[PDB]
């Protein structure tokens, strides 16, 4: 596959949030939201990770201090068109350039490399969902199958504010190509922004095709702007990975009140009864038996141990057939 | 708005609540049912609460004798009509008169607002809610849109035993024009006893109107006759408190293992961990991490203290900046 | 009713658990599947008790060494026909015969017993469902209303593959009869392996009639082949016990988060915080009250003794009125 870089739109203001923290640094599963979206970007290869934001610069850099950023300020928050030229003086005219978005963590490697697989050659690899309800959400617009264009809920007629195939926001097309439709974008809206859903249409007026794709789960695509969103991102993912894990072999006495918020390495006939939480990287031996309400943390825990209820087990490493508690 | 005095019906026996603790005294969220009910009739001003009770009299004037209500005997189980008649010698003429259910908990003062809005001069504000299997509850007759009485489950035809829109119970009218209903009520009736939904047909036929209002939320109407009900309500309960906390800037790091039984105060970025638990009067500082599985009761907590999970804060006063427990 | 004996086939290899401990030993609430099903069995009058295993003899005979079954080896995975043609044998002429499983943990004695009503002399009592989604499902043939057949889906035509009712896999019939059936059994099939869902057919050409009956619920007859199914069927018995204790008389304060693994006795008022775990058998007197978190383990609480939350009671008998904990 071809060089690609990754734009990861983080501009907005985060209001909802009624909090001091930028909103995509709040955590899901320990960890920033952002985080999840830069992750997901290295593991596809992004030659370059641009993140655009708008306040809480410092805090940023200081959060995201460890990984390899390239910083965009966009000065006024003019939306995520105006956000995307601000980092196209960037896109390499070789690379793909794809764009994410640093409030929409759970959106998986998978699905972007299917993303990326359907993209026709000149033309944009596009990520939709269908929802029966698409108040709100941008109305993805074709004919005879093939994608046409976005139509703004604000901008779209009556007849087709019903359209039922919704623009996830998330795409990806070449840099050169992408460069040229960013400099056609304009004002004349509903609100005097530039509207980067409209790089659809140009495109289809320059005759180039655009594809359409679905994520494995809706929750890959959920955005978050305020807590009660994140919260209930939250319970998707824990419930998605205690259901990995139960398939796996991991037997967990209640999947709703578990709870990982890191990695877990687990050997075979492990048990773990209600409300444990798991966090940071974690070793569960084969047969490990963890006591309800237990919170495991950067430790590893030998063959056969058995940790009594509500143990806190932190930075450390136990010994095998340990017997951990009164019980 | 006009004075107004309530009534407040517990004069059911509670058989299957299987308790030696009158129905009604049976705790939501940490405050007894019918408390609950007399806090949202003090709220909205009632000159007087007329607590109207079958047995249990001691206990409940002994658990609710920081308040000043106004004690009905109901000799015998004769019905909420035969109730109302008891309490009718004291409404003023002048005011209105609201009748409300030891055990309706969660009606809010927002919606009864609104239900005394709607009361037309001269005559009935009547709650409403719209519930497809009307069976069992008593169904609205209404002729040209407006509503002309309600016919009793076992007093329904077939035709009529399909009529969707359903009684509350909660209706406010009058006190001049209640006496003059509850006079004319009869027992030829499907069980000889005096139907208080009579009281519409009554008030149609004198030619005044009666308007229906409806609850934001189907759960401020719902009554418990068991402890399987009041689970339920309380679920109901915890998680709107949840939903409005989360909306208003704490993290709960999950909504569905959050308990609040009294009042919570707090500041700016807090964060609830899984399975806390918040009594009486609460007020926590900004910046304040609660660990799981702790329980707060009757305490203040200082800004930026964090508290270790499975602690028991209780009746204190914290200093910012606290570390509490070993983690 | 008429002497009989059970055939409980535990025949399976339980690949999909990922698991050195035989499929039907893993445990729901605390006791193997197998044991609620050979106690179900028990309870219903069961002469004897067959057991027809694949591998895991060994750790089988020795988890069950206390009940008295009468093992029955499958050398081969030949289906559950062949399974019955190794237990055949053993069935008495003068018995009904009547076969579970012994990963279908739910299954009622309440249900079993209609079952075993609803047999007609000479014929089959057959466990059926409806479900629409029978995908995979064996499908119930029947002519004018009576039973025909099973048709098994790979064998089912796709006409006939959109029947609703489902085949539980639950039967009883004479015994002499089952001999008969089961030696005219067949491999030209989808899989050259008998069907046991044959002998449904072979009695009604006999002109032998065959009854269908329905569970109280659906978890009843729910199989487990995998732990994310387990979870799912602990959860649903969890839900049915914690809602029989509330209509009961026993105060939880959130059903949901309340495990019940043994036999709980209990008086009246009792109350039960969050998070508790009741294990082995346990009796709480009058007005007991559990606090939050705590483990209950085979002990046996006084009246009016209040324990602290977070409290592991264990092996312990506990006078009354006591104060277990500081709060």
């Known amino acids: 596959n071809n060089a690609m870089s990754v734009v990861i739109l983080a501009a907005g203001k985060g209001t909802r949030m009624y909090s001091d923290l930028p909103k995509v640094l709040h955590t899901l599963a320990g960890k920033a939201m952002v985080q999840h979206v830069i992750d997901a970007a290295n593991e596809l290869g992004a030659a370059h990770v641009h993140l655009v934001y708008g306040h809480g610069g410092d805090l940023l850099k200081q959060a995201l201090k460890d990984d390899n950023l390239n910083w965009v300020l966009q000065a006024e928050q003019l939306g995520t068109g105006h956000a995307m030229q601000q980092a196209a003086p960037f896109f390499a005219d070789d690379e793909d350039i794809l764009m994410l978005y640093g409030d929409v963590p759970l959106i998986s490697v998978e699905t972007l490399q299917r993303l990326r697989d359907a ?17 709100g959400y941008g ?32 795409l990806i097309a070449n840099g050169a190509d992408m460069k040229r439709w960013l400099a056609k974008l304009t004002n004349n809206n509903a609100q005097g922004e530039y509207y980067i859903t409209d790089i659809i249409a140009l495109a289809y007026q320059e005759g180039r095709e655009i594809v359409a794709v679905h994520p494995q789960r809706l929750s890959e695509v959920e955005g978050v702007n305020n807590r009660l969103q994140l919260s209930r991102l939250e319970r998707v993912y824990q419930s998605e990975q205690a259901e990995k894990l139960l398939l796996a072999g991991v037997m967990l006495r209640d999947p709703a009140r578990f709870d990982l918020r890191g990695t877990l390495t687990h050997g075979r006939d492990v048990e773990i009864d209600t409300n444990v939480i798991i966090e940071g990287n974690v070793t569960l031996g084969h047969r490990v038996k963890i006591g309800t309400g237990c919170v ?27 017997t951990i508690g009164p019980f």
């Open 119 to 135: 993209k026709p050659q000149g033309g944009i690899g596009l990520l939709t969902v269908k929802l029966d309800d698409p108040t």
């Open 139 to 170: 109305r993805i617009t074709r004919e005879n199958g093939k994608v046409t264009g976005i139509v703004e809920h604000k901008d779209a007629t009556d007849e087709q504010r019903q359209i039922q195939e919704i623009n996830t926001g998330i």
């Open 296 to 322: 495991i943390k950067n430790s590893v825990i030998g063959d056969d141990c058995e940790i009594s209820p509500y143990t806190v087990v932190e930075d450390a490493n136990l010994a095998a057939a340990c």
